[PDB]
Ligand binder design. Structure first.
Ligand SMILES: COc1ccc(Cc2ccccc2)cc1
Ligand SMILES: [Zn+2]
Length: 608
């Protein structure tokens, strides 16, 4: 197996067993300066040199056995960064190990980091830093074998201003005043469980905590600590359910971190410290499905990981499957089917957006000369789940397939696998149903673009109310607009209301009078629920309602979740009345946007 996203030496040549990170965080220069001690094991005889992944890194020196050795940075290869060859002071035999201390310093243009000014935070007093290494941004923080095929434990000592707090994707290991600087603190961290390097995370800021479980603290600025602790109160309940589905939780502590609005994703599953968007603070725990998702990743993604990014569906596909199983335990089987069916609708949207023949709509992709951030979508999430949901109904139901999953997690625990690894074990587990498995169009499910060859069976109980009301609006005439009222939503949950907008959005645009009437009777402008508002504003913009232009521009910039920001900007760019505003608003905010988010929105707006 070849990782076409990495320029480092493959796992067949050498493997990094441990990392010791000793660095200091300079907010004045916006740089990370320190040393990275990599314990590397040779996988072949007579190993004299190895290559590492770097990206906008400044290398001072390389120390092995107390003496400096010769190193060389090759030319940059765009998004992959610059390869770093290191000359070993001794030829290594197989399984032989050495420790390599690399003195490095990050660039302010680190694609893995976003530096926030005090004004960009809640407290307005202190600066802020958070990392995002998924998929291949860890090289922009430190020199490494930036590949998920290599797992590694790590320890870290991080120096930050004494009035600030540092947190990493590891177990907290005490804090002390910096002996070299009285104005700073040193936070120590330890990760005893081997992780892929993309799971390395760091956050520095005026953070506070509040315990909500025996092994869970919620971290954020003081302004959001209390709201977050309430919003995520179901965390421990979800952990207990997840443990019952995938086996014991092996990370010891599961803390949550609520980041500033510019956090690119809904959630990052960093071990011991899950990163989440503040747009989950709906006030009624209604977006806690994301928490169940990130929790589930502790088994599918963190324990059994994809060997390359071509098999990324292994991570999210199974994780969504566990996620919706957790919500199934909490709110019933009909609720699980509700989210499952809605997820198919999301798959419909992604395929239609890319194209029926677009390579990014394949379950297993080919990221050769392809920036992973560009290819990222809901396809591996939903098509992956669609396959597993299809296999569930095909092999005897949920209880039986949940048996496979637990065996699957235990079989490939602490290991990196491929799709064929998964498929072979599937046939191995269900050996008495190989005739059933052979009826599966594997080539279409795994390697063919567009919608899956077959649609799973979904319960329609909670969805019927959505379809009924949406069809009313879509097929509505002018003398049907008056009969609409606020009573139409009396028996609709927040999820049903959101699905209603999702269904209606698929047939956008609607007549402008329909949308105006909809605001008059439903008052959707008053809803702060990010998911509901996002689809409501998209419906308005696509239906050419100029009144929603400042509202869409506001939400697109007051938060940075690419799930919301990117479709909002594109819709605003497709609307002639707001095209100039959209491009201008982007240009005025791009310097302060997340580096990855700023790049992608630029491509979407075609202002690159
Ligand atoms: C969340 O950060 C990322 C970005 C990109 C990838 C790679 C990928 C994307 C889509 C389909 C298959 C593989 C993985 C993680
Ligand atoms: Zn995920």
């Amino acid at each position: 197996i070849v990782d076409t996203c990495s320029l480092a030496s493959p796992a067949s040549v050498c493997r990094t067993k441990h990392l010791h990170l000793r660095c200091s965080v300079d907010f004045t220069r916006r740089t990370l300066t320190g040393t990275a001690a990599l314990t590397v094991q040779s996988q072949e005889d007579n190993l004299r040199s190895l290559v590492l992944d770097t990206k906008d890194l400044t290398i001072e020196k390389v120390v092995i056995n107390g003496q400096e050795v010769k190193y060389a940075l090759g030319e940059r290869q765009s998004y992959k960064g610059s390869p770093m060859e290191i000359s070993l002071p001794i030829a290594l035999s197989k399984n032989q190990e050495i420790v390599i201390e690399i003195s490095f310093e990050t660039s302010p243009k680190s694609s893995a980091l976003q530096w926030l000014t005090p004004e960009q935070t809640s407290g307005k007093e202190h600066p802020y830093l958070f990392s995002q290494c998924q998929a291949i941004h860890c090289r922009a923080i430190l020199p490494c074998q930036d590949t998920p095929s290599v797992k590694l434990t790590y320890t870290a000592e991080v120096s930050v201003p004494k009035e600030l707090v540092a947190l990493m994707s590891a177990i907290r290991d005490g804090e002390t005043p910096d002996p070299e600087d009285p104005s700073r603190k040193i936070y120590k961290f330890i990760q005893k469980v081997p992780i892929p390097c993309y799971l390395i995370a760091l956050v520095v800021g005026a953070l506070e905590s509040r315990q909500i479980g025996p092994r869970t603290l919620v971290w954020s600025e003081k302004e959001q600590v209390e709201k977050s602790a309430y919003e995520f109160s179901e965390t421990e309940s979800m952990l207990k359910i997840a443990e019952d589905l995938g086996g014991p939780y092996v990370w010891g502590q599961y803390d949550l971190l609520v980041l500033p609005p510019s956090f690119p994703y809904g959630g990052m599953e960093n071990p011991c410290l899950t990163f989440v968007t503040p747009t989950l603070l709906a006030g009624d725990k209604s977006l806690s499905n994301v928490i169940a998702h990130e929790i589930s990743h502790s088994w599918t993604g963190n324990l059994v990981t994809n060997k390359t990014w071509d098999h990324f569906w292994l991570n999210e596909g199974h994780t969504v499957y566990l996620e919706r199983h957790i919500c199934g335990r909490l709110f019933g089987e009909k609720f699980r089917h509700f989210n499952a069916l809605g997820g198919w609708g999301e798959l419909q949207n992604s395929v239609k957006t890319f194209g029926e023949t677009h390579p990014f709509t394949k379950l297993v992709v080919d990221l050769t000369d392809i920036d992973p951030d560009v290819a990222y979508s809901s396809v591996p999430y939903e098509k992956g789940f669609a396959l597993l949901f299809y296999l569930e109904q095909l092999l005897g139901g949920p209880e039986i397939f949940l048996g496979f999953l637990k065996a699957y997690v235990e079989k490939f625990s602490y290991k990196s696998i491929t799709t064929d690894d998964w498929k072979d074990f599937l046939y191995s587990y269900f050996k008495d149903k190989v005739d059933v498995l052979n009826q599966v169009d594997w080539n279409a499910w795994l390697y063919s673009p567009g919608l899956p060859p077959i649609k799973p069976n979904y319960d329609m109980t909670l969805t019927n109310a959505c379809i009924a009301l949406s069809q009313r609006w879509i097929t509505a005439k002018e003398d049907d607009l008056n009969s609409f009222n606020a009573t139409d939503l009396k028996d609709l949950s927040s999820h049903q209301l959101n699905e209603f907008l999702a269904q209606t959005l698929q047939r956008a645009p609607l007549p402008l009078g329909h949308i105006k009437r909809m605001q008059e009777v439903y008052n959707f402008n008053a809803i702060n629920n990010s998911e509901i508002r996002f689809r409501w504003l998209r419906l308005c913009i696509q239906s050419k309602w100029e009144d929603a232009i400042p509202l869409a521009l506001k939400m697109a910039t007051e938060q940075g979740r690419m799930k919301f920001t990117r479709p909002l900007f594109k819709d605003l760019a497709a609307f002639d009345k707001s095209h100039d505003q959209a491009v201008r608003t982007y240009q005025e905010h791009k310097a302060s946007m997340h580096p990855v988010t700023a790049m992608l929105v630029g491509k979407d707006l075609k202002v690159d």
